[PDB]
UniProtKB/Swiss-Prot annotation, chains A, B:
Co(2+) binds at D21, K182, H213, H215. Lys-182 is carboxylated in the free enzyme and helps to coordinate the cobalt ion. Lys-182 is partially carboxylated in the complex with pyruvate, but is not carboxylated in the oxaloacetate-bound form. It comes from the Bacteria. GO terms for molecular function: metal ion binding; methylmalonyl-CoA carboxytransferase activity; pyruvate carboxylase activity. Binds 1 Co(2+) ion per subunit. Signal peptide: none annotated. It comes from Propionibacterium freudenreichii subsp. shermanii. This is Methylmalonyl-CoA carboxyltransferase 5S subunit.
Amino acid sequence: PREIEVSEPREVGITELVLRDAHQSLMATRMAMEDMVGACADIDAAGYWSVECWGGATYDSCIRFLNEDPWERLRTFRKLMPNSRLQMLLRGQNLLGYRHYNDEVVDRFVDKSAENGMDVFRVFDAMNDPRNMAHAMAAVKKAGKHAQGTICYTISPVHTVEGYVKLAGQLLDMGADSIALKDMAALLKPQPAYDIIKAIKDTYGQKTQINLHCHSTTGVTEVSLMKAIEAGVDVVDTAISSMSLGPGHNPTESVAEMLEGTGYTTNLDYDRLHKIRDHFKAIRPKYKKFESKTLVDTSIFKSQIPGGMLSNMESQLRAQGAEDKMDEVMAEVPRVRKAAGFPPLVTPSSQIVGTQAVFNVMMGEYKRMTGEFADIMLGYYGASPADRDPKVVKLAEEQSGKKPITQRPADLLPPEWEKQSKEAATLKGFNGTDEDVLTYALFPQVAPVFFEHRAEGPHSVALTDAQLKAEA
Amino acid sequence: PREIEVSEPREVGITELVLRDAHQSLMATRMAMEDMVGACADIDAAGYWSVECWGGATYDSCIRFLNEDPWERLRTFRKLMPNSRLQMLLRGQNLLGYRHYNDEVVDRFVDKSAENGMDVFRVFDAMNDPRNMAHAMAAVKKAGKHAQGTICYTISPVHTVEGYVKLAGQLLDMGADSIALKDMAALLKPQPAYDIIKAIKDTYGQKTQINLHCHSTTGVTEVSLMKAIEAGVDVVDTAISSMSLGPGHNPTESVAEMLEGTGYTTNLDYDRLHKIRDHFKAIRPKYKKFESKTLVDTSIFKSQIPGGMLSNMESQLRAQGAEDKMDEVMAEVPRVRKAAGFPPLVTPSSQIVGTQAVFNVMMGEYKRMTGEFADIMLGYYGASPADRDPKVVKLAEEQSGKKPITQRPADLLPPEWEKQSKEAATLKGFNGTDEDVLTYALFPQVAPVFFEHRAEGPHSVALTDAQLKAEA
Ligand SMILES: [Co+2]
Ligand SMILES: [Co+2]
């Protein structure tokens, strides 16, 4: 017999993800505002620490598929849930866009987000480079909001508990009000969850607020949440049960109920949770055309490849002809990842590494490198967790003609707000607000079409009751 | 800071449920033998402690829907998995049938099961009355096989840790080689799992073998499995990941992977598991017409009513007309359950209590009692966990004309083997074996039709590839 030290009896906070990450992960971010507003009053009174409802891929989805202004959605959520802490996911210097922006664009985006109601900003970087998060977080502090620095969890030869403890320290040094451990691929197992949370708390103090964000893709993370709570985690992210599991998240009600008698508890109102659950249970069937077909996939623990990346490369192998080389492409991913400095395999790094892996198997090793892969190797996306392969770096410079850099990429970007503002002002439909200039700066190719059709009002791409009933 | 005592580092055994409980729970027990045999070689070499592949509702499904002889399925499994411990679920004195049988029928069934290859017999009773399990377990010991006495876990005012420890002792006293904690409704939370397993081990010794069987219906039991392992559980039941979650069970691969670095481990071969997973992933879509629509339901923690029982009563309220009394029927279930002595709400007790609850709301309190409810109240199903309501008992006697009993029901049953054998021998198709007489004794109304069509060979009720592709 042995013993395990566990935290003192206490309340654990819960962050609800149904309005953002749950539908992004389970139904391609297609959830229409019309299908969510009806649950806002109950969500607002359920007792959550925060409600994630903006950022991530929802900005793109609003203007590209739902003809909806993302800023109007944020204003509506602020109005319908006046007593809640609203939370968003922001990818640092890239904001919600496709590239790094000059510091002034980051300042304006954060300022308008805060002005329109955002309370908690979860700032992250796909390569875990703190320098890419530094300016956005300073802007959040300037706005007087809560800055949550994020650490993307991954498994690799260079990622260790000591490495995560070091990263947490760098985030606290740049003003983070809290630290978020983000496990998008559900790779965080129970013992590592306990060990990392405990090491951060022991090193920086019990006052260090840590929020754990785990998906349920591999089926092991609800046990990780329990171990994280024993290690002292302050808040855990979950999704209402009718919109949970699979590539999504662990169920809110299940996480609350499992704590009975352990000394830990949540302050969630079960009656409100039941109403929220029933609300989405009635709406989810309309999104069947966008659902995934796998509830549990643990293959990543061996292959390091997330199912979303795997099927993606598979489509590239068929449309290319030789798909009988899938087993070869999978053995190549680890090699490419290593060459790139072992970055976490989350969007967009995953698509980039996967594509380069397919190219190496097709036209030979680094014979043809995508422009994005070349940029990673040359440092235009920031620093990697480990040193990149000098041999491959050299090849990237000889194919791109760009010189390798090691300093924060945005240091080289010139002011661009005036240029963005002038170009945006020439599009039919532009309403003159900084919000619209931001939409143009973030999605130049979609902004034109959106501005022209926005007046029609938001639409839904979900099946109608008639179509649903017509299918049965 | 506090501490929790956990068991010493050790290997935890795993029982695979894909061949029996997984499809019984997820696709109405309709899995065709043709769709399972292809995975037997891999299952046999995966390293499981046992493979559940018989008993439960599969006997009924074979002869009622698949025109398959259950004894041929058992023989086939024995031949294709020669190195594995085969396991079945047997409902004590009721065997796999609809009523209590005379001791001689129980003796013959167990003898033929053992003769045809069964290794582990999980014997249980829906009301947790050990007397109804006693004879079947003696028959298992006579056959030299492994007798696993079962405790059905439930939550009620009269169920306590001390009560379960007492039951475990009674099972060990009647020769149990191991104790199974069966949680069909997924009501077992983490702390209770730890407390009960620890109390049994502390009271009867670390040598006491305990197997935990939890469904994943409420979404909290994988954490319960982890706590049960910390408390010292010897074996846990799981289902291959492509046939898991929902009303089913926690994923085999997820349970094995979550233990990395905790000091606990399993001896499962991940490559074999991957092959089994892929096998069923390709077959499951063909059974879509029999799938359920809810992955997680925690309402039972408040209502004591399992979703399978809830929807069932709902159908009775509509086909009856007044379904606007559903909220009244749900408040009645607890009252009826209490009157019956708080039996666990598992089949068949659940359907019985649910029906009587609907009757009380319709024609008044116990105005009209079903014959089955009357039998429970009068003791013809055995003793209840708590004392039954004398007032309701009296009413049952005045409506059935039967006198209340308190001794084991089978004590009153006369020899019946010769009578069963003669009647069975008059049916066209009867092959003269004791196995066929057992089929007739267990399912008198289906045996005639089955014996006449068995020669056509087993069929499948799943969609064909053509029908599947035709639907897409
Ligand atoms: Co996420
Ligand atoms: Co079961």
